[PDB]
Amino acid sequence: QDTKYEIMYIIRPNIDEEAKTALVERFDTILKDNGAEVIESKDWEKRRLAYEMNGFREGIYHIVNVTSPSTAGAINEFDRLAKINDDIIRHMIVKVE
Amino acid sequence: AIKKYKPTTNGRRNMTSSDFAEITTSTPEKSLLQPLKNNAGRNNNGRITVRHQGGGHKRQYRVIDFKRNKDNVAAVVKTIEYDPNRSANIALVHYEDGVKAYILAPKGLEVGMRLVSGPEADIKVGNALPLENIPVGTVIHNIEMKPGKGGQLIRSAGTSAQVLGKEGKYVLIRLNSGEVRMILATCRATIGSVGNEQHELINIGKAGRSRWMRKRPTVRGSVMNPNDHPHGGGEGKTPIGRKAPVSPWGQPAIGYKTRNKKAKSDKLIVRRRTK
Amino acid sequence: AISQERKNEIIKEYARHEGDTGSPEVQIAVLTEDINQLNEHARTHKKDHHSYRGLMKKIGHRRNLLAYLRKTDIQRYRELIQRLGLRR
Amino acid sequence: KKNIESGVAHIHSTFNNTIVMITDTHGNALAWSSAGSLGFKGSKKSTPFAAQMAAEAATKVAMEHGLKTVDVTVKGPGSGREAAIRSLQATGLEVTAIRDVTPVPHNGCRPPKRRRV
Amino acid sequence: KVDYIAANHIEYIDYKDTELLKRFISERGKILPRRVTGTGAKNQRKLTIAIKRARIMGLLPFVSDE
RNA sequence: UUGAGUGCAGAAGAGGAGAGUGGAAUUCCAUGUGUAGCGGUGAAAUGCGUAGAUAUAUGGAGGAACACCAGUGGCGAAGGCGGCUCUCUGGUCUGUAACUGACGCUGAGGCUCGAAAGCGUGGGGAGCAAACAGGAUUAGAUACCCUGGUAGUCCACGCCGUAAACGAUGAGUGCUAAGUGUUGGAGGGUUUCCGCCCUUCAGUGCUGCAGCAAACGCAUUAAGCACUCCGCCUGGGGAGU
C-alpha cells in the first residue's frame, strides 16, 4: 500500500489570519499536485515555546495528515518549499501507523 | 572526464585531456557569431602592452546573455556546445516567441529544460532572479555589480559564491577566497555554480600545445641581460643581490597589497583574506 | 525487496500444478527477479557491503538448485535455460 | 553610586585558585577579589580562609556604592565555596540564591590526557 | 512489587501526550532510568525516542532550573 | 518425509548506504562594565595582561564529537555498530505445513570483506596532539612535569593488507544431573493478568553432578561421549633471518 505522514509546522504568530489561510491554501494546493492525498487539516494549538527558536517564544501549531506512495515526489517538494519561506519556523515529518 | 594517452613518444608521456562527453553537436548558428582579431598585446600605437601573447589557431566571438531582460517567457534549451572564447561550455536558447541567443552552463542543465528569468521564478539552477527574491543559502552567478550591465563577476569554469546575510541596503555576498563585500540590492543574477570542473587537472605536455593556445614562452629573470632586467648578468650562476626580488619595472613581487588606497569601494569590503 | 503482487504472480505463471511454491523452476524464477533488483540496488549504493553479500548468497543458492535440477531431468532444464536467459 | 541594591555576584574557583566578582543584573562589573589579589601565593590560594578574606575585601568595597541584595553564581567547582558564601553573609548582605551553572558538554570536544607524573 | 504503564493501556504514544511525557522526565529535565521507572524494557526505547522527538519542537526544554 | 529449502501469519533488533537537520559545550570575532593581575606545580619558573588580560553579559561565525537514556542490553561474519528524521536495501527468531522430494556439510588453489597507524590525489581544519621549541626537576634527562606548537587526527576516491584481528578454544551434527536470572516469542490455568503460576521454542550470563584433565580448571554455550571435512605441529637459538 502507501504511507501515512504527520506534518506539523510552526508558523510566525505576528502574521494575520489572511496570511495564515493563504499559507494553508498554498501548501495544500502544492502537496496535492504530486499524488499526495489530503486527510485532515487541524490547527493544533496556539501554543507558546519552552525556549526561543528563531525570533519567537510563541507560534502556531498546525498538523496535517497525508497518504502517498513512498517513491513519488510528494515529500521532497514540501521539504524544498518549507525551509525557504519565512513563515515556517520548524516542521517535522514522521511515518505514521 | 579525463583521458590518459598511452606513452608512445617521450613527449606524449605526461599528457591529460578532457573527454567532451557532454557536447551534443558542434555546428553552431550563423547569427550569434562575430569575428575577432588577435591584438598580440599591441595597441593602436603598435607597441607591446603586456608580454607573452599571440600566435595560434583562429577563433570567433559569440553573443552571450548577461542581462536576461526577457521575462515571463519559458526558455527551451536544446544543445550544449563548446566555444573557443571561455573556459566554460555554453548552451543555446529557444524562446517561445522565437528569439535565440547563448547562455552559460551551470552543472545540471539538460536538453528540454525550461528556465524562467522573471522576478517570480521558481528557485532552481539556471533561473534568473533579482537578488531580493532570493533567500539565504543558494549558489548564485552572473552577479551584477551595477544594474543594467549584466554579469561581470564570476564567469569561468568551476568557482562558486554564497549569500551570507541580507540587510536593507546593501546585500552581503561571499565570493571566492572568502572575501565578502557590500553589493546592491537591485541586481539580477543566476542560480548555481559553473559547469566544467577539471581544468585544474589537465596538462599541456608539448611546447606546441600551449602554443596552440595563444601564449608564448618567457625568459627567466637573471637569464636576461645585465640591462633589460635588473637581476641580470651574473658570472656563472649568481643569486639575487638586489633584495626583495624585483619585476622589470620596479615593483618587488613578494607581498604588495596594492590597490589604490582611496578607492570608492573601500567602505564596502570585509575580510580581504587571500590575494 | 520485491512486491508481494509479482512475488505471488510469477509463481502463478510458472507453476507445474496448483500450489507449486516449491517446484524448482519457480524458486529460481523468484531468485532471478530478486537478484535482478538487488543488483540494481548494488548499482546504486555500491558502498553497501551488507547487501552484495546477499547477492552472493542468492546467486550461490540458485546455482545449487539449478545444479540439482539437471541430474534427474534435462528437458525441464533445457526449457528453462532457453526460457530465462542464463547459462554462460 | 546610584543606590542599586539589586545585583549578581559570581563565584569561580579552581583546584589552585579562586575568583569572586559582583556585577549588576546585566551585569556591569563593580569590584572583585582573589587570593592572589589579596596577595597570597600560588599553592596557598586554595584555602577557604583566603576565600573568606577575599569575600570580605570584595563586599566591603561593593556595598559602599549602594548595595544590599544580590544573587549568587557558582561556577568552577573547587574547594572553598562552603566558606565563601557564609563569609559573604558575614559582612552583612542579602544572599538569596543557591544555583549551579557549571559547564557540562554533551561530549563535543576532547579533554587533555592523563597525568603520568 | 513495582508499577507499570500498561494498565492504562499503552498502545501508541503519538509524540505529544503530556500525561505520559511529564511522568518520566527528571525535575531538572533529565531521563529517569529503568531502576526508577518500573516499566517494560521495550517501553524504555519507545519513551526515549518519544521524548527525543519532544526536544525539537519546543514541547519540552533541554535545561531547566529557572 | 524427519534432513534441507519453499510457502503463510507475525515479532524483535546501535544491519548498511544516501539525504537534510536538532540542541548544548569548546574556540574566535564584536560590544558593555571593570582594573592589577591571570594561569601553572610537590614547589616554583618559562606563558598571558597597563596597546586593558583574567571576569560577566549580549550578538554573529565556525567546525568537531552526540550528555541523560545505557543495561553481562540488542544487531552483525569478524574488524565492530548508539542526536533526530526521511528514500532504497539486507539478514535472525516463533507457529505453520496444503507445496518440492534429500536439493546436505566441510571445502586445497581462487574471489570478496577487512580497526588504528600509512601513502597518493582534492576539500576542510574547533579542540586533541607524534616531531620540534622553551621553562622546571634531575649530577645527567633530547623522558616522566608545564606552557606551547607542525604533520596527523574529518570528509571525497584509489592504494596497503596488518593487531593481544582473544572466549589465545575451526566448522557441521546427535547423546548425557541439576539450580539460577535475563532477551524475544508461543501455549494453558486462574485471569478485569496489565498485574501471577506452569509448559515449550531461539540467544545470553552465574553456581555446580557424571565425565575430562599433569594441575590450573572446563562443563548443555563441554576443554565429556562419538562421526564427516579442513588447517596446523614435532627442542631452544641462529631467525620468520
XYZ file of C-alpha atoms (C1' of nucleotides) in Angstrom, chain D residues 10 12 16-17 19 21 26-30 32 34 36-37 42-43 75 103-113 115-117, chain F residues 23-26 32-44 55-57 63-67 126-129 144-146:
64
model
C 29.953 35.462 40.590
C 34.645 30.914 40.137
C 44.604 26.027 42.831
C 42.860 29.416 42.950
C 37.792 34.386 41.835
C 33.216 39.330 41.418
C 23.083 42.993 33.299
C 25.880 42.900 34.724
C 28.455 45.615 34.544
C 31.408 44.827 36.773
C 31.833 46.572 40.114
C 36.363 41.815 42.637
C 41.017 36.736 44.674
C 46.286 36.292 44.582
C 44.628 39.711 44.589
C 50.434 30.227 44.420
C 49.776 26.897 46.083
C 30.998 28.420 38.517
C 29.632 23.761 32.080
C 28.821 20.195 31.154
C 29.210 19.457 27.464
C 27.385 16.758 25.550
C 30.747 15.207 24.530
C 31.592 17.528 21.678
C 35.312 18.062 22.172
C 38.176 16.298 23.794
C 39.809 16.697 27.185
C 43.552 16.539 27.719
C 45.395 13.356 28.597
C 48.954 12.785 34.103
C 51.883 10.369 34.058
C 53.609 12.122 36.968
C 20.478 21.052 20.988
C 24.109 22.242 24.171
C 29.914 22.503 25.236
C 34.657 24.478 23.306
C 29.207 46.965 27.642
C 31.365 47.145 32.612
C 35.802 46.656 35.279
C 41.028 47.493 36.641
C 46.219 44.638 38.518
C 46.716 40.528 37.768
C 45.522 35.884 35.253
C 47.407 30.858 34.586
C 50.590 26.690 36.059
C 53.140 22.980 40.034
C 55.425 18.597 45.047
C 57.261 23.665 44.863
C 58.449 27.455 41.552
C 35.664 38.474 34.877
C 30.454 38.984 33.309
C 26.591 39.946 29.899
C 33.780 23.053 12.764
C 34.068 18.932 15.922
C 32.085 14.976 18.624
C 26.451 13.427 20.145
C 25.267 14.376 27.802
C 37.437 23.614 16.797
C 39.789 21.008 20.215
C 43.435 16.996 20.890
C 48.132 16.059 19.508
C 58.449 11.454 33.294
C 56.358 17.824 34.913
C 54.421 22.807 32.478
